[PDB]
């Protein structure tokens, strides 16, 4: 009975309604793909590996995990109905980090930076 990771969030669901919208296209081609290149993106590019990171309490505390690897596949797979569903997943990712960690932590300064840039990029979306 060593620690294990939960299964990752789904990135496909054939019975879920979906669309490709200009805004969701933009969220992938511009927003995600620009945030992915940032110096602070790396901890967020895949589900938190609580076993690798020796954070056995991570999934005790965080019950709605989210990361940009999952978001990226959702966008590529056209999993979303609208931009707001996707924005909500970015918000969950940030909020998770701020819940598990504390102000001033390195991982928190990283999230805060990404979050400010995210907000700047989604300030204006296509029609």
From Swiss-Prot:
Domain of life (superkingdom): Eukaryota
Compartment(s) where it occurs, according to its Swiss-Prot or TrEMBL record: Nucleus; Chromosome
Result of knocking out the encoding gene: Embryonic lethal. Embryos ndie shortly after implantation and are compromised in their ability to maintain an inner cell mass.
Domain Bromo: 19-125
UniProt site positions, description: Acetylated histone binding: 101
Covalent cross-link (Glycyl lysine isopeptide (Lys-Gly) (interchain with G-Cter in SUMO2)), residues: 60
Signal peptide: none
PTM entry text: Phosphorylation by CK2 disrupt the intramolecular binding between the bromo domain 2 and the NPS region and promotes binding between the NPS and the BID regions, leading to activate the protein and promote binding to acetylated histones. In absence of phosphorylation, BRD4 does not localize to p53/TP53 target gene promoters, phosphorylation promoting recruitment to p53/TP53 target promoters.
Protein family: Belongs to the BET family.
Any further remark recorded for this protein: JQ1, a thieno-triazolo-1,4-diazepine derivative, and I-BET, a benzodiazepine derivative, have been tested on tumors with success. Treatment with GSK1210151A (I-BET151, a I-BET derivative) has strong effets on mixed lineage leukemia and promotes myeloid differentiation and leukemia stem-cell depletion.
Function statement: Chromatin reader protein that recognizes and binds acetylated histones and plays a key role in transmission of epigenetic memory across cell divisions and transcription regulation. Remains associated with acetylated chromatin throughout the entire cell cycle and provides epigenetic memory for postmitotic G1 gene transcription by preserving acetylated chromatin status and maintaining high-order chromatin structure. During interphase, plays a key role in regulating the transcription of signal-inducible genes by associating with the P-TEFb complex and recruiting it to promoters.
Subunit description: Binds acetylated histone H4. Interacts with p53/TP53; the interaction is direct. Interacts (via CTD region) with CDK9 and CCNT1, acting as an associated component of P-TEFb complex. Interacts with RELA (when acetylated at 'Lys-310'). Interacts (via NET domain) with NSD3, CHD4, BICRA and ATAD5. The interaction with BICRA bridges BRD4 to the GBAF complex. Interacts (via NET domain) with JMJD6 (via JmjC and N-terminal domains); the interaction is stronger in presence of ssRNA and recruits JMJD6 on distal enhancers. Interacts with NSD3. Interacts with NIPBL.
Free-text note on domains in this protein's UniProt record: The NET domain mediates interaction with a number of chromatin proteins involved in transcription regulation (NSD3, JMJD6, CHD4, GLTSCR1 and ATAD5). The C-terminal (CTD) region mediates interaction and recruitment of CDK9 and CCNT1 subunits of the P-TEFb complex. It is also required for maintenance of higher-order chromatin structure.
Protein name from the UniProt record: Bromodomain-containing protein 4
Source organism: Mus musculus
Whole-protein coverage range: 42 to 166 of 1400
